[model samples]
Target: GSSGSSGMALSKRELDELKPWIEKTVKRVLGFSEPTVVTAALNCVGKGMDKKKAADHLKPFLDDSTLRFVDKLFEAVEEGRSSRHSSGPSSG
Candidate 1:
């Protein structure tokens, strides 16, 4: 089931667009007032744990919003790795 469709990657612009929302979400959820709020989620997931578990890993047990937040961060991280070898619009 999970093999039928390949995952879609986000461009740098798309990922950048989400940062504001990500910052707000984490700030509200985690009550963080730090300058780099986005790094909270990013650093948590950066520890090599599965993306699906990042929310719980970061918060122990949170709500659906945080669950979805981590999913978005997961996509961003995936595209980040993809962005490394990408120069233009060609994946070929």
Candidate 2:
């Protein structure tokens, strides 16, 4: 869902099919990352995730580095994403 919203894939097919699986699977395996992002990823598990909550959580991050606190909070997610490119795997 988040990936699809981010315009993640080349076509809607992958976004619709693959996106939901990964989001739910990873979050289920990882527990929770941003709770809702995790839940949406793991909806089958329980409360799951909701897109609206994800937006609310990330709303303050609408613009990068807008505040020091925001920056500090964002680095975890940001680094996790970057580390993926440098190394095939990363865990937080």
Give the TM-scores of the predictions, in the order they appear.
0.42, 0.24
Candidate 1 accuracy as lDDT: 0.53
| Highest-scoring model, TM-score | 1
Candidate 1 per-residue lDDT over residues 26-91, each given as its tens digit: 666556634444755655544544665566654543444556667666665544444454555554
Q: Which sections of candidate 2 miss by over 4 Å? A: 1-9, 33-92
lDDT of 2 by residue, 1-92 (tens): 12323322222442344345445444444444244443332222122223444334434433221232233223323333332334354422
| Regions more than 4 Å wrong, model 1 | 1-37, 60-62, 85-92
lDDT of each: 0.53, 0.33
